[PDB]
Amino acid sequence: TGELKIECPHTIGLGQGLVIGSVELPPVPLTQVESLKLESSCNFDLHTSTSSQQPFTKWTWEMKSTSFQTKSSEINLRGLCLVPPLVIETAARTRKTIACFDLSCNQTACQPTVFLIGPIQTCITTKSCLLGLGDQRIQVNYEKTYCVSGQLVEGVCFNPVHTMALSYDIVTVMVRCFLIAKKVSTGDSMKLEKSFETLVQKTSCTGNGFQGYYICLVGSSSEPLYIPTLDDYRSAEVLSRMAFAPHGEDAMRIIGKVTGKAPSTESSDTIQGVAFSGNPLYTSTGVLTAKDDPVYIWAPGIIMEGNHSVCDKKTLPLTWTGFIPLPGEIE
Amino acid sequence: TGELKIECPHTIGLGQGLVIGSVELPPVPLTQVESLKLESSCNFDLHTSTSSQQPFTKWTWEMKSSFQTKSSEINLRGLCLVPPLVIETAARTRKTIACFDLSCNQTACQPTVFLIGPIQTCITTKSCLLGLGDQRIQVNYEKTYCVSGQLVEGVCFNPVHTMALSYDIVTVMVRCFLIAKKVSTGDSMKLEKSFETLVQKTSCTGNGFQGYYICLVGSSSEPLYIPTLDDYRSAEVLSRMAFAPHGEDHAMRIIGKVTGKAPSTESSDTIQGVAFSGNPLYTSTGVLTAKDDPVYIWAPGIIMEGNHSVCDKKTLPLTWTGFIPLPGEIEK
Amino acid sequence: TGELKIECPHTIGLGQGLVIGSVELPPVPLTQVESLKLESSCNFDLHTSTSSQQPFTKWTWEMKSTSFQTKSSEINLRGLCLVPPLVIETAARTRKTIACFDLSCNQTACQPTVFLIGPIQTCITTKSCLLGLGDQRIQVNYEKTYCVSGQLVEGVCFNPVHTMALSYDIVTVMVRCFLIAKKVSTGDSMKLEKSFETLVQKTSCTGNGFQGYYICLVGSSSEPLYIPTLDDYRSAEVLSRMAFAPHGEDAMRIIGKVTGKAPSTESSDTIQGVAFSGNPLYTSTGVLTAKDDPVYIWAPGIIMEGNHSVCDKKTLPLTWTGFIPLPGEIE
Amino acid sequence: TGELKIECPHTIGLGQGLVIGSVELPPVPLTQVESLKLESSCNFDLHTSTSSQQPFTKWTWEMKSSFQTKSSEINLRGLCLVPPLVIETAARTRKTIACFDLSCNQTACQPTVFLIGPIQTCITTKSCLLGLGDQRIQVNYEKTYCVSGQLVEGVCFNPVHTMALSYDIVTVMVRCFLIAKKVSTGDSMKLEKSFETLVQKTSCTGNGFQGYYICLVGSSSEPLYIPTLDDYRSAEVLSRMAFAPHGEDHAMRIIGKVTGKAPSTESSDTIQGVAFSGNPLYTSTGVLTAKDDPVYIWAPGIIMEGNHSVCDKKTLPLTWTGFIPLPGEIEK
Numbered sequence A, C: 001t002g003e004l005k006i007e008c009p010h011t012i013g014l015g016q017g018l019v020i021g022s023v024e025l026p027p028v029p030l031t032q033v034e035s036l037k038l039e040s041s042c043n044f045d046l047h048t049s050t051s052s053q054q055p056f057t058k059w060t061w062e063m064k065s066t067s068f069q070t071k072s073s074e075i076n077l078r079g080l081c082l083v084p085p086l087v088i089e090t091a092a093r094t095r096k097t098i099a100c101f102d103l104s105c106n107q108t109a110c111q112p113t114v115f116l117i118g119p120i121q122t123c124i125t126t127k128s129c130l131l132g133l134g135d136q137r138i139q140v141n142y143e144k145t146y147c148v149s150g151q152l153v154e155g156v157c158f159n160p161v162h163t164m165a166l167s168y169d170i171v172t173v174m175v176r177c178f179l180i181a182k183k184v185s186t187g188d189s190m191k192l193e194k195s196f197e198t199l200v201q202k203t204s205c206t207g208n209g210f211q212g213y214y215i216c217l218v219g220s221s222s223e224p225l226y227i228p229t230l231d232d233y234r235s236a237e238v239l240s241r242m243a244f245a246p247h248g249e250d251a252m253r254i255i256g257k258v259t260g261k262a263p264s265t266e267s268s269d270t271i272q273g274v275a276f277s278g279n280p281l282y283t284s285t286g287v288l289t290a291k292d293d294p295v296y297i298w299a300p301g302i303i304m305e306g307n308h309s310v311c312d313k314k315t316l317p318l319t320w321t322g323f324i325p326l327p328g329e330i331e
Numbered sequence B, D: 001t002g003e004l005k006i007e008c009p010h011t012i013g014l015g016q017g018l019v020i021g022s023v024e025l026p027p028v029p030l031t032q033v034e035s036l037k038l039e040s041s042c043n044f045d046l047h048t049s050t051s052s053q054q055p056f057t058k059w060t061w062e063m064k065s066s067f068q069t070k071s072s073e074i075n076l077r078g079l080c081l082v083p084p085l086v087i088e089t090a091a092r093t094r095k096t097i098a099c100f101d102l103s104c105n106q107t108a109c110q111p112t113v114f115l116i117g118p119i120q121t122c123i124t125t126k127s128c129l130l131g132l133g134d135q136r137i138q139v140n141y142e143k144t145y146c147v148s149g150q151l152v153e154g155v156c157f158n159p160v161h162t163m164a165l166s167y168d169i170v171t172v173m174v175r176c177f178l179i180a181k182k183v184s185t186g187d188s189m190k191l192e193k194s195f196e197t198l199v200q201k202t203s204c205t206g207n208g209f210q211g212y213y214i215c216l217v218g219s220s221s222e223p224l225y226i227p228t229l230d231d232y233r234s235a236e237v238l239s240r241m242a243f244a245p246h247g248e249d250h251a252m253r254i255i256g257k258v259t260g261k262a263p264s265t266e267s268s269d270t271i272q273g274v275a276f277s278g279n280p281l282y283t284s285t286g287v288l289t290a291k292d293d294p295v296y297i298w299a300p301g302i303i304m305e306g307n308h309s310v311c312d313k314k315t316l317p318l319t320w321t322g323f324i325p326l327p328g329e330i331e332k
Ligand SMILES: *[C@@H]1O[C@H](CO)[C@@H](O[C@@H]2O[C@H](CO)[C@@H](O[C@@H]3O[C@H](CO)[C@@H](O)[C@H](O[C@H]4O[C@H](CO)[C@@H](O)[C@H](O)[C@@H]4O)[C@@H]3O)[C@H](O)[C@H]2NC(C)=O)[C@H](O)[C@H]1NC(C)=O
Pocket: A027, A028, A029, A106, A107, A108, A109, A277, A278, A279, A280
């Protein structure tokens, strides 16, 4: 039994906050990954979006005798954290709970990371409940916070700044973000990879057309944070940490550079990365930055290219976990 | 001097809540019971209903050589016979209900005094005095030890806001008063039929009583109407009533089965019960379930039949005190 | 040097309060009493009313061989506590200070009691200052209170009830009252002795026509309290304590009953009392209750009749000091 | 890093008050003084007046064999030459004044930085940085230790509300700035005449300077105009100025009497003073009292003549820091 801890605040407050928790489970063989279904015994209202079938290009490597053979094909996965637009943003109002997983994989095995997001009211209704994923049971524990006004962060009770203007103590908090595909008809407002390129590039990249955004939750509970929100200091912070740690923040053995075709029907290579063996470390899921219409990739045993300074064959991860410093008061 | 504690909340809140408290006094001889009058020195607006004259059949037993029972019609005053709507609208009318029930053996009665009223009394009043016969009762209004809930067996507990459909479980006190209320057609007020259905008993016909219970939960709440089908608490109270028909706020020595005529003018027996001696334990007041028009009974030294599985000669108690489990949150 | 202590509150508050203090001085011979003038070096605005000439009937006794010879005459005194209507009541607004004395006398000597009443602002302007009376110097000391919300009473900090409605701790406080002559054209609203008679009499007195009232200060500082104010619990309390202790509340040797003519031009006796010797105990000043127009009396060596149960030949004292219980909070 | 403390009151109150603080920095060489610029990283609205170019006569002395003095006209920036109305209306305009005065010997100057501004700065700002040449200044806004007054030599003191006509006495700091202000006819602005009358000196004619002092009392106050006849504090400040014309915020070795030409184009001497060496003690800036149009002087290593009993060749200082006794109430 794994443990997914939810830190519950003393009050609901302004209505629009969500709780979030997550746990990384033990390794399962690859052949079992396509069968994985999240089950819930919990007394909450599961959003059905994530358990539908979702098309991915599977990209894999084998030793050959540069010394690699890669290949790819299109398959359907279910239960992954591909959250539709507005679902997280309006979950406090709809009273919907999002439960989904990401995959961190080597060639032969995957560690699912289960994410649970939902309304703060769940803390009134629920002390503990169970999720299942394949053969693993997950104990969700809702636990009331030691603090009076904030959250337990690095063993310290902390409340961040709230005002919209400019004016403190500084505490480093966890941020968890989910990639959302969202197109507009006209212009470049949703061209997410262009935002990264302005932050970390010298010269002009021609074709990074992916349209979407990240939706993030800060700490154990917060209102959703949209990335990018141009004049928000927290958005700026998350983007900068993403730009320097594109596979998130926290033995794996690097073998070499690999390329491949995504989707597999492409005549030439559209993706690159670094093949590895040993313990999976980063998530193995992302989207090509080059296509407006998302091309989703699952690349077990390969760290797909996420360096924003590169122009071609790069990706954005489906989920991203890191840390940002927040100004506020320790109490 | 007895002590009647009122637990006062920090705020009035949504306006319709009432405070309630109650105390059981020492035994008084039976001959003094017909003279008992509640006096008040308190700065609140007493509802006058309960101090009017109210006709009861008095049913008593004597050893013979075996039992001899007898009955007669008398008038009592001050008992908890609350008219319809009085408790339900007390928060709006600003009326205070003060009345007693009687728990009696053959020779003595312990009055239980009940005080119910608007939460505003907590602003106007720290302490005041009630008198009953020769006993003085100190009413003490005290702010609650809890932040938001109520002190329940030494624990601060806040119950869920009551929802129809959909953390901690605490057993809380419920106090209920029987209200006689007729409607012109149908069975919506046939309270004893509700009990019969629950105890799986469909053959009865002495179940024409029309009325309901009005209850307060803990030390303060809004009134709870029994039965209300879509309130989970109503279902709980009815079960608890069905299992403990004489309440559970509680040596008493059982002697045997007795019957009698209520009212005394009946040609055959209309009531049964169990004669006892020793310490009065349960209340000695109720109504026959068989008559649409209430026949009120005072039966000192007899536990009147309240088992809902029986069809004939049974009764409903005038007041009922018991306990139900509530879901909620225990403070800190 | 005598000491007149003023207890100063922390704030002025609602504007209309006055401070009061008083001290009883040592005995002076009678011949010196007619010369007594209050002098002040204090930085406050003295009301001039009390230092004007004021006609009194002097009533005195001598042993003779019932065994007494009494006599009387009309004389002018100055500086006594004969305060005009409205002066105390509006002193907080006018910023006037009242300084005057009453006399407590035996046949040969008088102890003046000096009263000082004035605006609470004096506590900002003044730490100490000097009054003189004949050959005595009086040190007025303004001292800031130990308490946060109330006054030091019996070594305890106390704040009385403030609301106009009915609802506590109970503390006994000093009350000091001054008799004010005030006539109306029509009716019995100002017939002060009639109020006493209703409280303490069996049958009907014919002729107690004095018109006036008492103005009182409670503790070391308060707003003026008018006696009688019919629906005020404090007025009721003061009147009852007056009725049971008509010469005030706190060795003197009683000799016998005496009568006399007030004013001295009366053909028959209009006043009675009890002759004494030894240490003066009560004040020796009052007014006849019988006359609408005040007949002021100074009766050294005689306790003038103040028993309200009597109908004829009785008086009201010019000043009155006693104690009443107040409901409130000790803190 | 130097420290400029601002004592912040609990409330803003009647709207027209300003906070003031000041700090004297370490010595800097003379050659660097003409390059000194105040920089600010603070979140307040700096008034631009004081950072403009301002013409001064520089008057200096050298040993000879006896003294050789000389003078020339130069432009300084950043000095406390505040225009009329700027301090007086700063609470309404929300402008902050930051400037320095100079206290100099022949070879080095200690700048004294003054910061004056609206009390609202206390809401917006806990700390910020000023720079002057190579020195950093930490401005620290700190809530007052007192309930209502100000910390004066380790004692909490609240002065009387100032009344014209009519408890404790505390000596408080006053800081004043000289303001040049002409009027078209009469002697209402002839500041040096006011001083002359007070020191009993009616024969003088080099007293045509027109202007006044604007002062702040303690760590915060409303501006005080000197002279204001019906303000008791004005009378006190003028006396204190007359007795200590170079202030009293304060080894210095006196060498002798010197004279010079201000401006340098004058054919005869128009200024005198006392040459010194060692630690600069007083400020080295002022204006000639003789000219209606201000002639500003910077005299490093010379205490310019400020004795009001003298008629000719005298000056008024640009800033003045001293102490006056105020009536009020010491807290607890
Ligand atoms: C992808 O990652 C997975 C998980 O990180 C990884 O598979 C695992 O590898 C470890 C070690 O290589 C396996 O560990 C074994 O566990 C059994 C359980 O009883 C042990 O008995 C074994 O012990 C023997 O082997 C050791 C060899 O050094 C000895 O030290 C020891 O004394 C014993 O002789 C053994 O350690 C584990 O079972 C798998 N896990 C899974 C889920 O299959 C995998 O290697 C990674 N893939 C690649 C291609 O890198």
